[PDB]
Amino acid sequence: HALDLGSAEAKAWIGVENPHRADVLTELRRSTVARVCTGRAGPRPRTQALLRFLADHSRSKDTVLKEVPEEWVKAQGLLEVRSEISDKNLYLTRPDMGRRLCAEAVEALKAQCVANPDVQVVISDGLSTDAITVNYEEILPPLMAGLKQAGLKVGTPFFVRYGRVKIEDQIGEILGAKVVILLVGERPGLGQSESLSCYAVYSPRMATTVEADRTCISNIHQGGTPPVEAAAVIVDLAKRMLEQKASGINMTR
Amino acid sequence: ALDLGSAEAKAWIGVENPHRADVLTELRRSTVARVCTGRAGPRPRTQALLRFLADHSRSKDTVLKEVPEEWVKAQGLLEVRSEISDKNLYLTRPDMGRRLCAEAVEALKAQCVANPDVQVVISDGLSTDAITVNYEEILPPLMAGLKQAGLKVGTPFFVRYGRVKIEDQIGEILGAKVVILLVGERPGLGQSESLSCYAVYSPRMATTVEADRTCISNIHQGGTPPVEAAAVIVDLAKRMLEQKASGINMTR
Amino acid sequence: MKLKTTLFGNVYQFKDVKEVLAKANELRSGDVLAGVAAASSQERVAAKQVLSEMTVADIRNNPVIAYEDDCVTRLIQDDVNETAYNQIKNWSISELREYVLSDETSVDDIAFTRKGLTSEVVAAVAKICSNADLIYGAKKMPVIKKANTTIGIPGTFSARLQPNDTRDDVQSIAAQIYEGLSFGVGDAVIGVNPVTDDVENLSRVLDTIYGVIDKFNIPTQGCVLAHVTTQIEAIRRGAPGGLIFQSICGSEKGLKEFGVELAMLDEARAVGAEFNRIAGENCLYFETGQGSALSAGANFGADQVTMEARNYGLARHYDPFIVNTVVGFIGPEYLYNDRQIIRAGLEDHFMGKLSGISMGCDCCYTNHADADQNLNENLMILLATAGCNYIMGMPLGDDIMLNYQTTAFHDTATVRQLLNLRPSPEFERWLESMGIMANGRLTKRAGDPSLFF
Amino acid sequence: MKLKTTLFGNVYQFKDVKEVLAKANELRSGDVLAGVAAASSQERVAAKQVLSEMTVADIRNNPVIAYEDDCVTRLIQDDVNETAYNQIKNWSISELREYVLSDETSVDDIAFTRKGLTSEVVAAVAKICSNADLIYGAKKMPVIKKANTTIGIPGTFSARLQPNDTRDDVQSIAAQIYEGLSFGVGDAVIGVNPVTDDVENLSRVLDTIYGVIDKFNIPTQGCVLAHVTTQIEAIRRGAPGGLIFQSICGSEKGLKEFGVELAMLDEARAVGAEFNRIAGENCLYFETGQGSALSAGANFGADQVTMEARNYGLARHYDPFIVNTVVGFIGPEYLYNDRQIIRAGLEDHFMGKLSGISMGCDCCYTNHADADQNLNENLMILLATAGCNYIMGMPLGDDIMLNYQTTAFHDTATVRQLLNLRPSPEFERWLESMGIMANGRLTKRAGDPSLFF
Numbered sequence A: 001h002a003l004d005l006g007s008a009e010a011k012a013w014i015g016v017e018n019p020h021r022a023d024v025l026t027e028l029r030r031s032t033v034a035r036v037c038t039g040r041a042g043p044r045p046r047t048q049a050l051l052r053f054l055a056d057h058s059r060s061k062d063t064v065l066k067e068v069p070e071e072w073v074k075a076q077g078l079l080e081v082r083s084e085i086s087d088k089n090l091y092l093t094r095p096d097m098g099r100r101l102c103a104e105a106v107e108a109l110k111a112q113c114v115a116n117p118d119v120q121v122v123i124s125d126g127l128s129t130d131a132i133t134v135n136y137e138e139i140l141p142p143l144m145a146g147l148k149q150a151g152l153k154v155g156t157p158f159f160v161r162y163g164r165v166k167i168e169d170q171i172g173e174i175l176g177a178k179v180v181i182l183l184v185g186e187r188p189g190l191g192q193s194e195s196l197s198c199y200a201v202y203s204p205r206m207a208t209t210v211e212a213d214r215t216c217i218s219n220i221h222q223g224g225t226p227p228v229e230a231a232a233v234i235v236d237l238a239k240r241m242l243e244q245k246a247s248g249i250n251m252t253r
Numbered sequence B: 001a002l003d004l005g006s007a008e009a010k011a012w013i014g015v016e017n018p019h020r021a022d023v024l025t026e027l028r029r030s031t032v033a034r035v036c037t038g039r040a041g042p043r044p045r046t047q048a049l050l051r052f053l054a055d056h057s058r059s060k061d062t063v064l065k066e067v068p069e070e071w072v073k074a075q076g077l078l079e080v081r082s083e084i085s086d087k088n089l090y091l092t093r094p095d096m097g098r099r100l101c102a103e104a105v106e107a108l109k110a111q112c113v114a115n116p117d118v119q120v121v122i123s124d125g126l127s128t129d130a131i132t133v134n135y136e137e138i139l140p141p142l143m144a145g146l147k148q149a150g151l152k153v154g155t156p157f158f159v160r161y162g163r164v165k166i167e168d169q170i171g172e173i174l175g176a177k178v179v180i181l182l183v184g185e186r187p188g189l190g191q192s193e194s195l196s197c198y199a200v201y202s203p204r205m206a207t208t209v210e211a212d213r214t215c216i217s218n219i220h221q222g223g224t225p226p227v228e229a230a231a232v233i234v235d236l237a238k239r240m241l242e243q244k245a246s247g248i249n250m251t252r
Numbered sequence C, D: 001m002k003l004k005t006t007l008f009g010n011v012y013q014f015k016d017v018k019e020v021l022a023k024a025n026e027l028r029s030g031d032v033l034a035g036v037a038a039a040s041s042q043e044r045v046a047a048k049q050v051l052s053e054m055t056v057a058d059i060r061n062n063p064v065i066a067y068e069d070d071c072v073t074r075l076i077q078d079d080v081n082e083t084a085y086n087q088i089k090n091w092s093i094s095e096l097r098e099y100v101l102s103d104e105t106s107v108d109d110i111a112f113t114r115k116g117l118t119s120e121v122v123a124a125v126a127k128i129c130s131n132a133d134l135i136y137g138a139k140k141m142p143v144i145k146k147a148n149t150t151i152g153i154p155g156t157f158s159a160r161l162q163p164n165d166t167r168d169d170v171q172s173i174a175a176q177i178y179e180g181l182s183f184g185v186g187d188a189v190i191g192v193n194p195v196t197d198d199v200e201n202l203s204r205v206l207d208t209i210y211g212v213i214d215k216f217n218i219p220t221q222g223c224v225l226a227h228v229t230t231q232i233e234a235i236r237r238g239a240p241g242g243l244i245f246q247s248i249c250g251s252e253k254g255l256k257e258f259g260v261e262l263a264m265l266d267e268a269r270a271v272g273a274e275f276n277r278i279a280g281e282n283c284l285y286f287e288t289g290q291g292s293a294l295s296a297g298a299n300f301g302a303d304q305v306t307m308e309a310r311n312y313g314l315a316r317h318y319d320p321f322i323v324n325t326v327v328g329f330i331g332p333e334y335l336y337n338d339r340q341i342i343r344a345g346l347e348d349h350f351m352g353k354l355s356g357i358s359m360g361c362d363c364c365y366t367n368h369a370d371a372d373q374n375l376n377e378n379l380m381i382l383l384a385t386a387g388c389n390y391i392m393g394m395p396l397g398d399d400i401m402l403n404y405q406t407t408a409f410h411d412t413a414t415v416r417q418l419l420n421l422r423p424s425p426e427f428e429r430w431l432e433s434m435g436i437m438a439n440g441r442l443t444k445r446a447g448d449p450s451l452f453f
């Protein structure tokens, strides 16, 4: 019969032939997103499982080069700014340029952003655009609300185009921010490309801050940690960061 | 110190404990093949691998180098090209190289003779060094041999970015009975001077199979010398006009 | 049959079987040049799914060239075992791939199954196979042939000594022969590509090869890769005959481009049985490779993978001792870089072993191609694990007359000692008696051509 | 020492050893990003020659990072056996390459010779090796360690079970464990990359891993690839200790980027000796990969191949049970395509084995790199022929959490049956008792996770 490789029926397909307990297989198949219980042809994967693998790869490769529309960020009321990177092609090959704000970038933040905030929220596409557009409206409003109800001096958000994680150190120095929160898209997986991550550092400094000084919250999407549920833990994290005056491995517990 | 492109490096014997070292010298000089370089277990020795990679770096540069336009005027030839525009397109479109461009047909019927008996066409093909190095040694005697006690010689011209099957279109535009094509073969690892000769009796874009052509390959200093070559193409050319055939359709 | 599928909610339509076979291929520069490749990675997967659900009958009844118009198609169709075909005529290509890969599928099971296949069906299975599929699948499909050496036995690995020269200089040819034998190369064949194609020169080259064979009583066979017509005439006139070679194409128009008729291969078969110095029953030798059909303008809109499989259905009729694709002999216009050449090598070998022929591979590349010698070393080892019957052998792989790089003499010795493989059993005894090999490994005095003096 | 040579009449002069080491590397996107790559094939070959003519002393006395400035340099220099060094200090890198590749060099010869090497010298040899050189040379340098399984015995092939989950769900992790055990994966380790880096989450993952181990009496070991400090804290508090893991970098600055002090690895060794459920004497686990030092701005102008060797020199000091490079884990900015990921995978494995560590490899790629799953199947087989100690295993290689593709459970079983390799002998006996494996091959009932219920 006809079958779409991207369909839910295909994703729940069981290819084990003559199984010991097929009821357990269905139990295991719904227990994980991993491509389990697809069977085998000798020691090789089965045809359909391979076909669904190659289909997802064609979709996953397209998410790499796609960019968030300049109109979408404007519709979110966000200030768009970019690193030294000009285009996506150069973004994949030059990580050092994605870690520095461009000349017009430094001056825009010093003009349109709140000086010396206690919590600064930065958002960048990173390596996944879907991780932004899909989860933004779900995580960001409760994030800003929790940091203000009842909170402190919150900087204004701004979108960083073609940005890497280390660029949040420059944003902390420029804006004098106490805590910089970066929501950035991770590299695209095979099955999904909606995975968002959070990198937070206390009072960053480009010269001394090592990578271990950041706290990481990964797999923020519908298939992992819910964005609204994630929004609350980032809020609490920002609290504890300001009380302890430390981040990453430097925090207790 | 050792230059990997030197004759001393080419004549290097790497066999550690030979049975007859005097034989190894005899065998190494008996061929251009990279024999007698020894081994490190079942793997090539370091110097032999280095000279391999060094020769390869040079061979890759002989692929993309092109004959200058100042060199083709010093020989007095018509500058005609096919549908290909640059070297990068030629390596991926062999179909466009088998057909002339639009302004090419208008220069052949205008600046050449009509219905010649032998037509000499030259093209760079896949190697430039195959043309420049052997040009002055094979062309002067080729044209002289075809007019010494020969017949109606055509006008020579240079086709840029050309293939072999492009002589089928020349054989009809000019209407020649025998078309002679000197083209550069793809570059080898150790050299790129190797030249070939593709000849066919009365080609026809609709019916000529590649088996109807006669091929004289490996024309260079290491293979068939250009002067000796030139003489054997003129003989070849006389045999095509007599037996009215070419390639497998010939005898002897 | 369906020529349509839905992928992520997108309907992909295909015109006929010929287009599905082409667009199911992994990306290669030849299919782009042929204008038959898929337009996107999504359409390629779509073609694979459509192809996977087609049955054996759907592809057996839709060859890329018509029966009444192509003698190669007729030869492929006339040789099919119809009983073996009826057993699998309704299997999908998906089920045939799983049948081949199954560990419960024995060698004898495949021996009868493959008789119900055509070349188009053979190509269809390879198109939906990954690289490890093509390697593991080919490994469990050994093909054993015998001339004066036995080739294809699992656990063995042979090699062709290829002593080519720019002037057919016999001193240069003999020098490369002693060099190859010192590394254990030559159990497949000692085959020379000649410069000039005349009976007198072929005999001179043949006497040189067989002078070495007769002097040391080498269990092997010589060959001169000229046209089959001049090989037959030379042997008829008294030249020593070993393997009779011919370059083949997968279409009647392609054979005409090569100046070959099917009757010539019939004559070569009869000439070998009457004259050739062969102890076994196999004496023919063919070389293949993707792009030859499109180069001759004789692919008729079919992709180069399907056309290459037709070479094997043609070669299978004449039961040759050895066949090998010359994977990267032509140029980057048909196979561009390392990825494509490796893929084509695994494809060709898998399709050859699936077609029941003694399949080897000339792991090679050209200098105008995006490749180097590290590519040949990658492919030769992947194919060795695939059970590739033989590779080529030249001093460091540098062919001084064909202007390309194949595998070195060192490479066969490396592959054998790395994977614990032996030469042909007859040739191994000679190497052992010569002091060149002990327990499948080169001795201290191996790799030294001066040992024969 | 000479820092120049003449190639084709052109003089190629280099600044120091560090530039010679970098320009000798094969072309890769990482050396270009660092500004240390050769400008052409000619300069690369010239750098290889200058490197091949430098002596062991020339490179041992010129580490990419100074002794008094870097604790990894000190650790490498302090652990050198000076008696083994003085025997080979005057050997050129060309002679050391031929020494390693020699069939007359036994495993016991290399055992003492490698003690006189530094990581820079190890990197130097790899830079003048072909792909087949890297494969054959590594094959003749086996490294055998023992935890609850023995790994690295020639003729054996192990695999790490990697059951990761987007939320560290113990139902998702356990489901992937039963799937991998049904293919014979897990003799190296059952290692989980944790989403959250807290003690209580680690103990839950360890209790799930060892709950399966204790239920079926599996000879293996568990591990959660969090930071080493949190692993130490969990095991001290009562979590089941098996292997202790930490990511490492080839420079002190790179280790500070990961938040790692050398005292932590010393503490990990002491914690394992007091708490870990390991029968053998090896209980540590490190992962490496080209590009980590450059990513941390801690390469100090050195190429990623040289810096990667310094990882192995660091790891050898702590004698871990397993080390594997994660060859294509990061992205195309360090290794762009199939050609470069394969070459780096062969270099890494060769360098690891020459350093004397139990070198495995995570044959993997990312979706923003120019690669596909056929690359993973090409490299996993080449490295197996090289005697790679282990690879990874995931359902079809799809990591739902780390967002990359590694090797499948099918792939280990494929490699084992293609190359007639067995698992770790202790783990093989367990699979045989479970009816999963017979004579190294998967039984008919294998590949079925419902067998464990």
Ligand code: B12
Pocket (backbone or CB within 6 Å): A095, A126, A127, A163, A164, A165, A166, A184, A185, A186, A187, A195, A197, A211, A212, A213, A214, A215, A216, A217, A218, A219, A248, D193, D194, D195, D196, D197, D225, D226, D227, D228, D245, D246, D247, D257, D258, D259, D292, D295, D296, D329, D330, D401, D402, D403
């Ligand atoms: C690739 C990768 C790495 C790479 C980073 C190199 C690079 N990306 O250029 C390397 C190999 C160095 C690495 C190492 C580690 N990683 Co990591 N890594 C990833 C991965 C798969 C991708 C991250 C990503 O896509 N970021 C988005 C891109 C656009 O940002 P980027 O600026 O290009 O990359 C930066 C970040 O990736 C960052 N980074 C990468 N890993 C980690 C881990 C931590 C704790 C921090 C603070 C930062 C960090 O380093 C890069 C800049 O230097 C994630 C998995 C995931 N689902 O995201 C895990 C992940 C982020 N890593 C993780 C871990 C455990 C580690 C290590 C702590 C391992 C160890 N035991 O030492 C180290 C620590 C890194 C450090 N310097 O402190 C965990 C984090 C768990 C947590 N909640 O703290 C994750 C979520 C995966 C996992 N579960 O194992 N990692």
Ligand code: B12
Pocket (backbone or CB within 6 Å): B094, B125, B126, B162, B163, B164, B165, B183, B184, B185, B186, B194, B196, B210, B211, B213, B214, B215, B216, B217, B218, C193, C194, C195, C196, C197, C225, C226, C227, C228, C246, C247, C248, C257, C258, C259, C292, C295, C329, C330, C401, C402, C403
């Ligand atoms: C690659 C190659 C082939 C390829 C051509 C594919 C392609 N090039 O796209 C294929 C696989 C078809 C091939 C097969 C054969 N080849 Co061939 N081929 C070569 C090679 C190595 C390169 C030619 C080249 O670089 N030309 C320059 C480029 C710019 O021209 P091109 O238009 O791109 O190439 C065309 C011609 O080369 C032609 N061609 C290729 N080989 C042959 C052989 C003959 C006899 C003829 C007339 C034409 C021809 O086909 C191409 C497309 O039109 C030469 C070796 C050399 N030193 O030159 C041998 C060579 C030309 N081939 C030769 C031989 C023996 C053959 C075969 C006769 C083998 C056989 N027994 O069937 C067939 C002939 C097929 C044919 N009639 O076209 C001999 C010719 C000997 C002679 N006395 O004429 C050569 C010289 C090598 C040798 N063994 O000595 N070959």
Ligand SMILES: CC[C@H]1O[C@@H](n2cnc3c(N)ncnc32)[C@H](O)[C@@H]1O
Pocket (backbone or CB within 6 Å): C193, C225, C246, C247, C248, C287, C288, C289, C290, C291, C292, C326, C329, C330
């Ligand atoms: C002078 C070309 C030589 O290489 C062989 N060859 C190379 N590529 C191919 C190919 N694609 N098909 C058939 N034969 C081929 C051919 O048999 C001839 O002996």
Ligand SMILES: CC[C@H]1O[C@@H](n2cnc3c(N)ncnc32)[C@H](O)[C@@H]1O
Pocket (backbone or CB within 6 Å): D193, D225, D246, D247, D248, D287, D288, D289, D290, D291, D292, D326, D329, D330
């Ligand atoms: C969360 C990234 C995981 O992948 C591993 N990894 C990937 N690439 C590298 C690399 N280049 N060096 C060291 N470790 C690496 C790392 O140990 C960690 O466990």
Ligand SMILES: [N+]
Pocket (backbone or CB within 6 Å): C249, C250, C288, C289, C290, C291, C292, C293, C304, C307, C308, C311
């Ligand atoms: N072909």
Ligand SMILES: [N+]
Pocket (backbone or CB within 6 Å): D249, D250, D288, D289, D290, D291, D292, D293, D304, D307, D308, D311
């Ligand atoms: N590294």
